[PDB]
Amino acid sequence: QFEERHLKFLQQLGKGNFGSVEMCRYDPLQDNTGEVVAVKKLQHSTEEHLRDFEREIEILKSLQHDNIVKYKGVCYSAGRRNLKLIMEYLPYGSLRDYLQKHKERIDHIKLLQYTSQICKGMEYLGTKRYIHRDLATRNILVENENRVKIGDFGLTKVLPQDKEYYKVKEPGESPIFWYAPESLTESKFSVASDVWSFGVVLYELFTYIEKSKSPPAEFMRMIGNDKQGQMIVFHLIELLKNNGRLPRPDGCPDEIYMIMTECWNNNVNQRPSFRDLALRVDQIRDNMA
C-alpha cells in the first residue's frame, strides 16, 4: 500500500525489542500534504524476526478498537525484504512519558479513565485469544488527554486452540519485573499473566512514574541491590512465592491497591478477569465523580 520512496523520515521515536519506530511523513504528492505516520522496522532482518514481524503485522491488522493503535499498512522494497509496518502516529508519546510530564494535572479520576481504557483494550484482545505479554506504561500510547491505546504487539502470541496458556522462551532480556511468577518459572503466558502485568501497570500509573518508585527499583531494593546477573531472577522468584509485593504508592486509595494485589495472586485461576477489572474501576470512577 505504501511505497517507500514517499516515506519521508522525520525522526526516530524509539528503539525496542528487535524493532525501531520512526516518525515519518507519507507524502506521495511531494507537496507537504501527506500525513504523519509511525513506521516500525526491524533492526536486523533475520528470518525468525521477519516471520515474527509478519505475525505481529497480521495480529495488528486483525484488531480494530478505540484503545488499540491503528494499523495503516505495510511497505516493502526489493521484493518484500525490509518490510515496514505503517501505523497511525499518536502525538503525545508513551503513557509513561506523558504521565511523567503532566503529573500535576492528572488526578486519580483521570488515571482510572486510562485504566478502564486499558482494560477494555485487553478484554478485546482476550476475545481473540491474543496474549499481549508486554503490558507496561512505556508500551501504552497517548492519543490525546482523554484517550490512550495499547501500542506494541511484537511479543503478542495467539493461544493454542486446546490450551489457555502459551509457553514461550525467547532469546533476549525480559521485563521480569512485570512478569507473573508462572511466566518467570515455567515460561507460561496467559490472559491471567496479562492480568498480573496489568496490576503492575496500575501500580505504575499511581506512582506517577517517580524514579525510585518504579517496579525495577522497588523489587531490586526489596531483594537487595547486591543481586547481580541471572541470580537476580532467582531471588525475585522467592520474593513472589513468599508474597512479597510492590508497596502501595503514595496517595493511592486502599480500593485501588486492593485491585492491584488481587491481580498479583500467585494462584493463576484466582486472578480477576479484565471485564471484572473494568467493572470495578468504572464503579470506583463513578463514586469519585
CB of 139 to ligand R61, least distance (A): 5
Does 193 bind ligand R61 (CB under 6 A)? Our answer is no
Which stretch in 133-141, 175-183, 255-263, 267-275 sits in contact with ligand R61 by CB under 6 A? 133-141
Which residues between 16 and 75 bind ligand R61 (CB under 6 A)?
A: 16, 19, 21, 38, 69
* Cβ nearer to ligand R61, comparing 42 with 263: 42
Return the closest-CA partner of residue 123 out of 134, 111, 114, 131. Answer: 131
What letter represents residue 206's amino acid? F
Q: How far is the CB of 82 from ligand R61 (least distance, A)?
A: 17
Cα 126 → chain centroid: 14
State the DSSP string of 139-195: GEEEEETTEEEE---TT-EEPPTT-S-EE---SS---GGG--HHHHHH-EE-HHHHH
What is the residue type of 155?
L
- Closest approach, Cβ 8 to ligand R61, in A, equals 16
The closest of 89, 49, 99, 53 to 74, measured between CA atoms, is 53
Measured from the CB of residue 129, what is the shortest distance to ligand R61 in angstroms?
22
Q: Taking contact as CB under 6 A, which single stretch among the options 82-90, 179-187, 236-244, 263-271 is the one that binds ligand R61?
A: 82-90
Judged by CB under 6 A, the residue of 26, 113, 133, 151 near ligand R61 is 151
Neighbours of 82 (CB within 10 A): 14
Q: Pick the piece of the chain touching ligand R61 (CB under 6 A) from 27-35, 87-95, 184-192, 216-224.
A: 87-95
Report the distance separating Cα 87 and Cα 89, nearest Å: 6
Give the nearer residue to ligand R61 in terms of CB position, either 93 or 244: 93
What one-letter code names the amino acid at 165? Y
Residue 215: CA count within 13 A, CB half-sphere: 25
Q: Is 134 a catalytic residue?
A: yes
Do 33 and 114 meet the contact criterion of CB atoms below 8 Å apart? no
**Nearest alpha-carbon partner for 96 in 21, 192, 200:** 200
Find the shortest distance in angstroms from Cβ 4 to ligand R61: 18
**Does 213 count as an annotated binding residue?**
no
Site residues, ligand R61 (CB under 6 A): 13-16, 19, 21, 38, 69, 87, 89-90, 93-94, 97, 138-139, 141, 151-152
User: Per the annotation, where are the binding residues for ATP?
Assistant: 13-21, 40
Active site residues: 134
User: Per the annotation, where are the binding residues?
Assistant: 13-21, 40
